[PDB]
Structure formats: C-alpha cells, structure tokens
Amino acid sequence: GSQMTRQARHLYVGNIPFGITEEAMMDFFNAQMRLGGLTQAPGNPVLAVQINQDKNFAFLEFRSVDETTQAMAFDGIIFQGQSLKIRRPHDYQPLPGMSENPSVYVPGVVSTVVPDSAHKLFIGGLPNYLNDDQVKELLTSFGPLKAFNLVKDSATGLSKGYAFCEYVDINVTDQAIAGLNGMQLGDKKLLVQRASVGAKN
C-alpha cells in the first residue's frame, strides 16, 4: 500500500543480527506471532521486511493494524544473540478506536526500554565482545529482569562495554550490586551501581 497506510502497519526493528536476510527476519517474526497465539486470522501477519544493513535496522510490514500493535510486545526478544529493539515509526498516529499499546504480554521477553528510575542499574566494564544474550544471562542469575539494554557502537555492532537494567524485584538491585560490583571478567573489573549515581547530566 501507500506510505500513509503503512504508518499504523509497520514497526522499526533495531539491533538486528549482522547479515540476516529479509526472509529470515520475516520467518522469525511470523513464527513468533503464530506460535505465541498473537494472530487475528489464519496465515502470516508479516508481509515483508525491509533491511537497511549499513544502518543496522529493519522495518517490519504487517497485514493489519492490530497485529502491528501486538508485535510491540516482542521488544527485547533475543534472536541470534541480539536484543531486538522494536519501536513505532516516529510518524505513527493512534487511529480512532485502535489500541496504541499491546494488550497481551509475551512470557520471557524483557523490554529494552529502561527509564531512569530509583533502581535502574548501570553495569560498566563489560568485555566489549559479549553480546546482549550473554550479558542478560549474567544479570538474570540474581533474578528476573523487567528491562535491559546493552549499549552498542553504531558502526561496529560491538558493545561500548556498558549496559543498563531494572530487576522485577526492587530488592534484587542491591543483591546484584553486591555480587557483580568489582567482579573480574576478562581483563576488566565490573562497576555496578544505580545509574543515577554516575549519570552525566
């Protein structure tokens, strides 16, 4: 369809695996939607994927407004080691009577949106070659995460060596600090503290 028609029928997907094909991306999201019970009709909700490989993002094109909205619940899903960053197009406008936010939660998926808050953590000193899944697994031993993002270099996809997170249980925050702060990992030592402590400004 037209560009206007696509505003409510596609999503931005950032942090995509290097070298993934459009077909493999499409098959992944169709499988996740179908196997998660998140379709509104028989068949595949995702019609196409357009990748910008040099800029490390894709747009997923859906056949329906409601399926596009529900797919926002996959923000943070791990695929080939990467946490996919799912967002609305910047020009999205809510449509009359159509939900702006997903209605159903997808078990296991940890959001990449980590707002500044009392118990948001900064994790610094990570070896830059560890991927999102590996860092997530390091943090999850203390308890389940509500949100997590590993900061990547825009040009290499390598990490910048630091991440942010928020635990489901606010009390896990201090347990994760106690366990991980000062821990040797590679040639590095981790720094783990509430992000408000060292935030620039």
Author numbering: 141 to 341
What's written in the study?
U2AF2 is a critical pre-mRNA splicing factor for the early stage of spliceosome assembly at the major class of 3′ splice sites. Structures of the U2AF2 RNA binding domain show an “open”, side-by-side conformation of the RRMs binds to uridine-rich Py tracts. De novo mutations affecting the pre-mRNA splicing factor U2AF2 are associated with developmental delays and intellectual disabilities, yet the molecular basis is unknown. To address this question, we determined the X-ray crystal structures of Arg149Trp- and Arg150His-substituted U2AF212L bound to Py tract oligonucleotides at 1.4 Å resolutions.
The Arg149Trp, Arg150His, and Arg150Cys substitutions decreased the apparent binding affinity of U2AF212L for this consensus site by approximately three-, four-, and five-fold. The sequence of the cocrystallized Py tract (5′-phosphoryl-UU(dU)U(5Br-dU)CC-3′) corresponds to a 3′ splice site of the AdML transcript, a well-characterized substrate for in vitro pre-mRNA splicing (e.g.,9,16). Like Arg149Trp, the Arg150His substitution indirectly disrupted Arg146–RNA interactions. Arg146 appeared to be disordered by loss of a Glu201 anchor, as shown by comparing electron density maps in. Instead, Glu201 has shifted to interact with the mutant His150. Water-mediated interactions with the mutant His150 replace direct hydrogen bonds between the WT Arg150 and the N3/O2 atoms of the penultimate nucleobase. Neither of the amino acid substitutions significantly perturbed the other site–i.e., Arg149Trp has little effect on Arg150, and Arg150His had little effect on Arg149. Instead, the NDD-associated substitutions converged on disrupting Arg146 interactions with the terminal nucleotide of the cocrystallized Py tract. Unlike WT, the Arg149Trp, Arg150Cys, or Arg150His U2AF2 variants are unable to detectably promote splicing of a minigene transcript in HEK293T cells.
